[PDB]
């Protein structure tokens, strides 16, 4: 929809096809003026930028720290980690010593 996030969409940065729905309108020029009048919906990207608010880093549960490159959640404190151990003889010590 025009005026919201996703008003124009492109599949890839190297995409050749671009989808645009911005409700562009054309109207008569005034008498004795060359100005190409047009009225168009403002970009939804800037609207999202100044209406995004806080990101997932500020609301993630369990104290997760959200980073990008690549998108990840680190040091989340939830669940258990089962451990299976294979210790050789060399590590242990005899009861005689």
């Amino acid at each position: 929809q025009p005026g919201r996030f996703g008003d124009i969409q492109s599949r890839t940065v190297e995409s050749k096809d671009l989808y645009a729905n911005t409700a562009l309108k054309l109207s008569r020029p005034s008498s004795g003026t060359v100005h190409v009048p047009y009225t168009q919906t403002p970009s939804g990207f800037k609207y999202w930028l100044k209406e995004r608010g806080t990101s997932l880093n500020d609301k993630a549960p369990f104290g997760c720290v959200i980073k990008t490159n690549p998108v990840r959640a680190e040091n989340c404190a939830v669940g258990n980690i089962p451990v299976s151990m294979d210790i050789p003889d060399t590590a242990f010590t005899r009861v005689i010593d």
Binding site: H35, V36, F62
Partner: protein, 315 residues
């Protein structure tokens, strides 16, 4: 250097466009008609495109103190120290190149660009612009502090190197002028001011205008007659306020300087709040110099995030 970077413009020409508000409350035809303001910088820099070309003289060479523009038919001169940008106060200009000006502007509701004309007049163009830059980081500061931390941002590089971003260029259209005519008995004269002048007369022969001065036999006098200058050797920018000469592909090609580059900006660091520990209570003294964002969340299964912008002392 700057010379092999400005040589791209000599093949171009400034233009006169229709500005709807030239400082005062009325339109006129000014050489600083603002076309488009670009705001892709996270640090608050904005780019202004004007009709006049800054840094190029009458011949086409590069100087750091001359602005060339259109006043009627002939190109003329202007000085650079008088270019100013106004939103609510005075803006800090960081770099100018041809049609493009980048400047640091306070928050404002309008964008006025003016220079001192060669006729000692002041020529301006005013447009409406929401200049409300988003904060860089979490403090709403206006002056760069002398200590703090560095936060990444995007900025326009202050270089004149050519970039992938460019603007369309094309041949100027026919430029009519009523004063190029004088009424004479029989042979109406069309003063040939310029290189090539085109005419078409209902009572007279009309047809093509060719060049040079001609004495056209007709009793139509000034009426049923008018002339336009054509075959401009230089090029115009395809501005929305100037008619297109023809439905052909563009002719010239000019890049947009000051590309967006990765950078970082110093940001202020707020004072550490004063914390008194209550029994599973947390009370903080907040002393912001400016609107400061306070944020907390629970570290458990169900967080309860908070938001409030702090502008005064609060508890």
């Amino acid at each position: 250097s700057v010379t092999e970077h400005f040589n791209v413009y000599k093949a171009t020409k400034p233009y006169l466009a229709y500005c709807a508000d030239c400082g005062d409350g009325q339109f006129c035809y000014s050489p600083v008609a603002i076309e488009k303001i670009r705001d892709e910088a996270s640090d608050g820099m904005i780019k202004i495109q004007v009709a006049a070309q800054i840094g190029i003289n009458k011949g086409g060479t590069h100087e750091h103190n001359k602005i060339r523009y259109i006043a009627g038919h002939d190109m003329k001169e202007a000085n650079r120290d008088s270019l100013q940008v106004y939103t609510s106060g005075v803006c800090a200009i960081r770099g100018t190149m041809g049609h493009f000006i980048v400047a640091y502007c306070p928050p404002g509701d309008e964008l006025k660009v003016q220079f001192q004309d060669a006729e000692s007049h002041t020529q301006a163009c005013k447009v409406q612009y929401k200049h409300a830059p988003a904060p860089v980081g979490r403090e709403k500061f206006t002056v760069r502090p002398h200590f703090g931390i560095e936060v990444p941002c995007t900025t326009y590089q202050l270089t004149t190197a050519p970039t992938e971003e460019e603007i369309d260029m094309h041949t100027p259209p026919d430029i009519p002028d009523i004063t190029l005519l004088s009424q004479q008995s029989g042979n109406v004269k069309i003063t040939a001011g310029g290189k090539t002048i085109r005419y078409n007369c209902t009572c007279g022969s009309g047809n093509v205008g060719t060049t040079s001065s001609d004495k056209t036999i007709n009793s139509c006098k000034i009426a049923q007659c008018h002339a336009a200058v054509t075959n401009h050797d230089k090029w115009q920018y395809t501005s929305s306020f100037v008619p297109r000469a023809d439905q052909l592909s563009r002719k010239g090609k000019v890049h947009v300087p000051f590309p967006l580059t990765n950078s970082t900006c110093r940001v202020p660091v707020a004072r550490a709040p004063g914390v008194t520990y209550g029994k599973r209570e947390l009370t903080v003294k907040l002393h912001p110099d400016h609107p400061t964002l306070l944020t907390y969340r629970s570290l458990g299964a169900d967080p309860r995030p908070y938001e409030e912008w702090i502008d005064r002392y609060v508890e």
